[PDB]
Write a protein that binds this ligand. Structure first.
Ligand SMILES: *[C@@H]1O[C@H](CO)[C@@H](O[C@@H]2O[C@H](CO)[C@@H](O[C@@H]3O[C@H](CO[C@H]4O[C@H](CO)[C@@H](O)[C@H](O[C@H]5O[C@H](CO)[C@@H](O)[C@H](O)[C@@H]5O[C@H]5O[C@H](CO)[C@@H](O)[C@H](O)[C@@H]5O)[C@@H]4O)[C@@H](O)[C@H](O[C@H]4O[C@H](CO)[C@@H](O)[C@H](O)[C@@H]4O[C@H]4O[C@H](CO)[C@@H](O)[C@H](O)[C@@H]4O)[C@@H]3O)[C@H](O)[C@H]2NC(C)=O)[C@H](O)[C@H]1NC(C)=O
Ligand SMILES: CN1CCn2c(cnc2COc2cc(Cl)c(C#N)cc2C(C)(C)C)C1=O
Ligand SMILES: [Ca+2]
Ligand SMILES: [Ca+2]
Ligand SMILES: [K+]
Ligand code: NA
Ligand SMILES: [Zn+2]
Length: 801
């Protein structure tokens, strides 16, 4: 005589073999004997009808149309519509919600997270005619045109990111399928291992809430609970008394993802799943309205990822590239992860595998990487569950090991998982409620930001995460989070002229014996910082760690020079729309000049570069853009030199000689901050000096793993970058410092055919560069700090609209 009565969908999960009545009884195959009869009632379906109005409460029924259903909180959601002549929520005009309009005893507005699997961003416009409820939320509330998922653009990684504010590499759910070599265990969609708590790192919202005294409803719903029942359960929970009622709830829909896989993102069959999801939204909103909570609850309508057209004929097979294909294990599909089939195979060499997968067919539809060489914006490396070899797959394609795998399983027309900047992978965000703004459209943002906001909505302190708290304040009417700029840890030195030329023995020559007093005070003033206001538009960056460095001023650029790394941490310069490009004179071709402000012992030397047959050098401030022949000499200072592989110099030279001036023309001047990054342990964080794995031969000169640039101008491009009154515009890059161009399959062509495509692939947020350098940018603008935080999280994705 099993005991689920009274306990249907329990919040305090009890301990088996005492029988369960919650969303993980079904998932464990261990429900109390009568769960299905008591907790999954369906008799008479989900809608009141005229003839049910005022009925005699009968507890077999799925939901109720009896008089007493409201204070019980178990009416069918259309009860007041059918039996009281009330209107559907979707038929009421939008009215601003200026304050929460909540029953007494509510201590904060509840939050409902309505998550929709595979809801591609473009469905909001393309399906608007068949989703009236969703369209009301979007138009009346706060929405973005799209929301960026994390990579990989799969379900578990994304939903767990939403819950935690963490990148996959930090929370540990790095794919829908995974092998952990520490546990020696596999995580799969089908089956039970995925439930073990050691997979799931960070602190998800339901725990953050509970630890701070805020009760949560379930986040994981069994696939056997119909959607209408999930909705009714939420509404029932919302009717509980004060001391038991949760404040945060989640609803999950497996659609439109399930149908998008079968039919493709825009298959004609997709219209019905979109209508069904809208109806479910309408049920929730009508249900809240009956409870007088429709102007009390904050609702978030959010997806995990989009959906692209993918068919079994667009499959790449590794057996067409590798003679040795049976010696590897592939995690396949819309990304590839490769590891050895046996770790006892001493033959298995990842470099030979990468080499055999690189630019072998002319329109090859995947590109192989060592995971540390993946674009840093993906943040997809610092986890032992991520295999060393990664294949980034072109949108619309699959990769598989051998052809049998794809014909012992074309059944599907849709898939997802690709690079998170791909337009088809973008998803949705709408926020509706008293805490969200009214009829407001906000720019696109990343789903890692939402955890912080959900915490702000609930009055919770978020666990440490990868969002930038405050960057989404512009979504919110109140409960904004007002952070303070991080404190500078190291104050700069400001060295004057302290060394004579003969103190330097650098192996460096400069054939420059090229000797007024009007001009002599002029050069002195430039060295003392007289043009700094022009080249350092937003103040100097703050150094957020302990180190020794010098500010160096010049006519055309300013730098923060590290005595520890023997090069600039940052170099900052402004190029106006009218700047002229010039070429390096021959009296200066291999010229490098001692910097008499900086000791020989804290300087680079040219002999190390001569000796190092693989390493050459470039400059952070480009000599090509110097303002005068006198100022050009500053660009050849040893303190503006950085180590560069010759293959990388092709990239860098094209950027400096062609692209910067192009950007200045297009944007009405640009301010550029460039520098090195050292991330030898691929954790996305600045390396300390003891982490550096490579030096210029025979020297203490460390070799960067990457070079960054941050390119800022006026959002109103009719104002010049140096005289901007309002909001700013930025694009940035973190380019991999590689000794070959194997990544660029067209690299034998001229740079105008491949360098810009490389830079687009390695586009970056300012915030990414901050983590990687320990610098804080944009310290002195006339803009609000939250606006600046938004700017620092911006990613220029170079996708069409
Ligand atoms: C994105 O946001 C996140 C969150 O803010 C950032 O991640 C943090 O990065 C911090 C710096 O790397 C990191 O701090 C370390 O924590 C160690 C203790 O960590 C444990 O406890 C915490 C707290 O509850 C917990 O969060 C951790 O969770 C990780 O591990 C579990 C497995 O048990 C996973 O389930 C979970 O997914 C998570 O994994 C991720 O992080 C770990 C590293 O912590 C990675 O290896 C995984 O791949 C994955 O990315 C832990 O359970 C602490 O020991 C470290 O301190 C060492 O270093 C300093 C140096 O001065 C020293 O003071 C310490 O004593 C210690 O040094 C000694 O140990 C060294 C290492 O063993 C040893 O080599 C030395 O010789 C010394 O003896 C360090 O403080 C913090 O853990 C994570 N948090 C999370 C959740 O990931 C992330 O950086 C952000 N990303 C970007 C790009 O900004
Ligand atoms: C295959 N699969 C997919 C997801 N799923 C299932 C059942 N129910 C859920 C929904 O899960 C969530 C919903 C939300 Cl909204 C958030 C947040 N934030 C987090 C989760 C996780 C997953 C528990 C982390 C299921 O069978
Ligand atoms: Ca999904
Ligand atoms: Ca690092
Ligand atoms: K060299
Ligand atoms: Na190449
Ligand atoms: Zn899917």
């Amino acid at each position: 005589s099993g005991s689920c009565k009274g306990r249907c969908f329990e919040l305090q999960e009890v301990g088996p073999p005492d029988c369960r009545c919650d969303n993980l009884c079904k998932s464990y195959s261990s429900c109390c004997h009568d769960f299905d009869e008591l907790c999954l009632k369906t008799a008479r379906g989900w809608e009141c009808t005229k003839d049910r109005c005022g009925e005699v409460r009968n507890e077999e029924n799925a939901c109720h149309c009896s008089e007493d259903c409201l204070s019980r909180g178990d009416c069918c959601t259309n009860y007041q519509v059918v039996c009281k002549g009330e209107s559907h929520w979707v038929d009421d005009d939008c009215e601003e919600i200026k304050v929460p309009e909540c029953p007494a005893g509510f201590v904060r507005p509840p939050l409902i997270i309505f998550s929709v699997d595979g809801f591609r961003a473009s469905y909001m416009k393309k399906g608007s005619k068949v989703m009236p409820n969703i369209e009301k939320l979007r138009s009346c509330g706060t929405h973005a045109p799209y929301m960026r998922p994390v990579y990989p653009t799969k379900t578990f990684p994304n939903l767990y990111t939403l819950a935690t504010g963490l990148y996959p590499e930090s929370h540990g759910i790095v794919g829908n399928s995974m092998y952990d070599p520490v546990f020696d265990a596999s995580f799969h969609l089908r089956g039970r291992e995925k439930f073990n708590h050691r997979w799931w790192g960070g602190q998800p919202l339901w725990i953050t809430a509970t630890k701070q005294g805020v009760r949560a409803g379930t986040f994981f719903w069994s696939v056997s609970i119909p959607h209408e029942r999930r909705i009714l359960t939420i509404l029932q929970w919302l009717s509980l008394p004060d001391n038991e009622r949760p404040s945060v709830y989640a609803f999950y829909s497996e659609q439109p993802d399930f149908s998008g896989h079968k039919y493709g993102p825009f298959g004609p069959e997709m219209t019905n799943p979109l209508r069904e999801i809208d109806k479910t939204v309408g049920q929730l909103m009508d249900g809240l309205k009956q409870l007088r909570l429709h102007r009390c609850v904050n609702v978030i309508f959010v997806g995990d990822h989009g959906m692209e057209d993918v068919t079994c004929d667009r499959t790449e097979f590794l057996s067409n590239y590798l003679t040795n294909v049976d010696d590897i294990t592939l995690v396949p599909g819309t990304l590839g992860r490769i590891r050895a089939k046996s770790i006892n195979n001493s033959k298995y060499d990842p470099k030979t595998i990468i080499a055999a997968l690189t630019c072998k067919k002319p329109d090859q539809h995947f590109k192989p990487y060592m995971k540390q060489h993946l674009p840093k914006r993906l943040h997809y490396a610092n986890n032992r569950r991520i295999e060393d070899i990664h294949l980034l797959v072109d949108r619309r394609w699959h990769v598989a090991r051998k052809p049998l795998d794809v014909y012992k399983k074309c059944f599907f027309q849709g898939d997802h998982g690709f690079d998170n900047k791909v337009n088809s992978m973008q998803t949705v965000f709408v926020g509706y409620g008293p805490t969200f703004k009214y009829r407001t459209k906000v720019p696109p943002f990343e789903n890692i930001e939402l955890y912080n906001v959900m915490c702000d909505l609930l009055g919770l302190k978020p666990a440490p995460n990868n969002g930038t708290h405050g960057s989404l304040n512009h979504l919110l009417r109140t409960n904004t989070f007002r952070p303070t700029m991080p404190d500078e840890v190291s104050r700069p030195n400001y060295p004057g002229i302290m060394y004579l030329q003969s103190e330097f023995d650098l192996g460096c020559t400069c054939d420059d014996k090229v000797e007024n007093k009007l001009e002599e005070l002029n050069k002195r003033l430039h060295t003392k910082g007289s043009t700094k206001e022009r080249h350092l538009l937003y103040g100097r960056p703050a150094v957020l760690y302990r180190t020794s460095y010098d500010i160096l001023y010049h006519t055309d650029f300013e730098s923060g020079y590290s005595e520890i790394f023997l090069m600039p941490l940052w170099t900052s310069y402004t190029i106006s729309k009218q700047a002229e490009v010039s070429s390096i004179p021959e009296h200066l071709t291999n010229c490098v000049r001692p910097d008499v402000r900086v000791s020989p012992g804290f300087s680079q030397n040219c002999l190390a570069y001569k000796n190092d047959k693989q390493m050459s050098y470039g400059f952070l401030f480009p000599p090509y853009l110097s303002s005068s022949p006198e100022a050009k000499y500053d660009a050849f200072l040893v303190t503006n030199m950085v180590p560069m592989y010759p293959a990388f110099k092709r990239v860098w030279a094209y950027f400096q000689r062609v692209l910067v001036k192009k950007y200045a023309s297009e944007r009405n001047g640009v301010n550029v901050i460039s520098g090195p990054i050292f991330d030898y342990n691929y954790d996305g964080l600045r390396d300390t000096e003891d982490e550096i794995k490579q030096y210029v031969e025979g020297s203490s000169i460390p070799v960067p793993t990457h070079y960054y640039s941050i390119i800022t101008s006026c959002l109103d491009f009719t104002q010049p970058a140096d005289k901007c009154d309002g909001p700013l515009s930025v694009s940035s890059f973190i380019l991999p410092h590689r000794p070959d161009n194997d990544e660029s399959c067209n690299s034998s062509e001229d740079e105008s055919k491949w360098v810009e495509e490389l830079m687009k692939m390695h586009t970056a947020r300012v915030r990414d560069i901050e983590h990687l350098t320990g610098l804080d940018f944009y310290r002195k603008t006339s803009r609000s700090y939250s606006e600046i935080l938004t700017l620092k999280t911006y990613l220029h994705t170079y996708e069409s609209e």
